[PDB]
Amino acid sequence: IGIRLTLPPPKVVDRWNEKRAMFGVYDNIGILGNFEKHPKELIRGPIWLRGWKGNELQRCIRKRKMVGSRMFADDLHNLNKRIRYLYKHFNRHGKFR
Amino acid sequence: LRNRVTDRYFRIQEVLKHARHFRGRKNRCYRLAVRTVIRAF
């Protein structure tokens, strides 16, 4: 019977956190900071998608090319198998042509 | 499982409240109930 019997402990969310009250600051650091920095230089994450958006094939092509020289040995083989699969899916399968 | 269904109990009881006066397992088992509750409607 997949439904819980006691109602869960209450989710207390501080809306005036440090990360919440100062969220969004310096997203316009270009257009009113004399264009020294782009806002794409403000995003922190992986190296291969710091300022770049693609589908799943274009992400694995970019991950193999940018950071794939220093990837682990069976993480590179799991990535090469994924590009070998997503090539065949996007180019040979599907409804529209 | 990012978001799986938490309210599936109440979707079963939308059908199973109409089947309470049936015979056999049509009043209990949901798979047998919808083929009769639809047919009763």
């Binding site: 997949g2 439904i3 819980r4 019997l5 006691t6 109602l7 | 938490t6 309210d7 109440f10």
Partner: peptide, 26 residues
């Protein structure tokens, strides 16, 4: 544990109707 609150609240109020259908108050 399925995460969420809105389905655990409704079941808490369907238990309280059955607690009055099993034991009706004076």
């Amino acid at each position: 544990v399925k995460k969420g609150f809105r389905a655990a609240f409704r079941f808490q109020k369907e238990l309280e109707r059955q607690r009055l259908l099993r034991c009706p108050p004076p």
